[PDB]
Structure formats: C-alpha cells, structure tokens
Amino acid sequence: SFQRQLVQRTNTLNSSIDNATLTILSRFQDILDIAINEGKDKYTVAPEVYQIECHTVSMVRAVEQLLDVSRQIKSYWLTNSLSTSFPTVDYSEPDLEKVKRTLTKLQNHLLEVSLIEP
C-alpha cells in the first residue's frame, strides 16, 4: 500500500534520528563517567583517552548522520510535484497576419490568383 510506503519511510527517518541523536546523548554522557582518576591504576587510566576519543568522534559522526537525514528530509519536502505548469516567458504575442502573409504569399508566389470570385 502507498500508505506504509511513506509511513515506514518517515519512520525510518525518525528512527535514524533516534539513532544518531541517542548516540550523541550516550557518547556525550559517559565521557563524564570517564572523568574518574583516583583509586585506579595509571595503566588503567590509559584506555580512558581512547574512550573519550571514540565518544566524541561518535558524536560528531552522529551529527554528520543528522546532516544526512536532514538533507533526506529536505529532498522529501521538495520531491513533491509542481502544482501546475509554472510561468516563464509568454511575453509578446505573435502576429496572426504576418504568418498568414508568409504562408499565402510565399505559397502564392508566382501565381495568377483571381481573388476569390462569387
């Protein structure tokens, strides 16, 4: 059905939004969890840098994904058909009669026309 087309489509759009945005949420969230220092071995401090790296990079990544979905939604708003034919240039209506003179006279060229007659 045409219904589930656009519906499941837009649902994929919002679901993707849930994806990238929740990604930004949790990844920005747990960096705060990474802040702990005391009570942990210095070698155990080493991973935390890579952790923060993956979180932040996941964030800007998900942002880029949001740019993607946004451009998508742009296309969906804009993929709609033009309401009608749209204005361009209809300026200056052509002569009816110079056309007739070209037709007739250039076809009447070298002819002994006797007007119309009754």
Partner 1 sequence: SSDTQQVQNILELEAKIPDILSSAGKCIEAIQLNNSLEDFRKYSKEFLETVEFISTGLRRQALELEKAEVPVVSLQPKKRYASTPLSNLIFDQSSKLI
Partner 2 sequence: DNLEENKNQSIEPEDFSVVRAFMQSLHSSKEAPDV
Partner 3 sequence: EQIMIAQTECSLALDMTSLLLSKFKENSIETISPFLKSTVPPSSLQFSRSQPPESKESDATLAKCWKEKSLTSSCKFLFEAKERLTSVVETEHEYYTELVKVKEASWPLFNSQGSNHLSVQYSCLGGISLGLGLIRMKPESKSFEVQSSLLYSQAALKISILNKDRDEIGSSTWSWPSQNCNSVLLKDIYKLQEILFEMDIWNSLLQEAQSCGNQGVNFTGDEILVPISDDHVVRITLETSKQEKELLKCLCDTLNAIAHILFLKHCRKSDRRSQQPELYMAIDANAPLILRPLIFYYNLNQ
Selected from 1, 42, 50, 93, the binder of partner 1 by CB under 8 A is: 93
Q: Distance (Å, rounded) from C-alpha 90 to C-alpha 96?
A: 16
Which CB atom, from 70 or from 108, has the smaller least distance to partner 1? 70
Contact between 23 and 60 (Cβ < 8 Å): no
CB of 65 to partner 3, least distance (A): 12
Which CB atom, from 19 or from 48, has the smaller least distance to partner 3? 48
Question: Interface with partner 3 includes 113 (CB under 8 A)?
Answer: no
Q: Which of 66, 64, 31 is nearest to 50 (CA)?
A: 31
Per-residue x/- mask for partner 1, residues 2 to 31, rule CB under 8 A?
x--xxx-xx--xx--x---x--xx--x--x
Q: Which of 34, 15, 27 is nearest to 59 (CA)?
A: 27
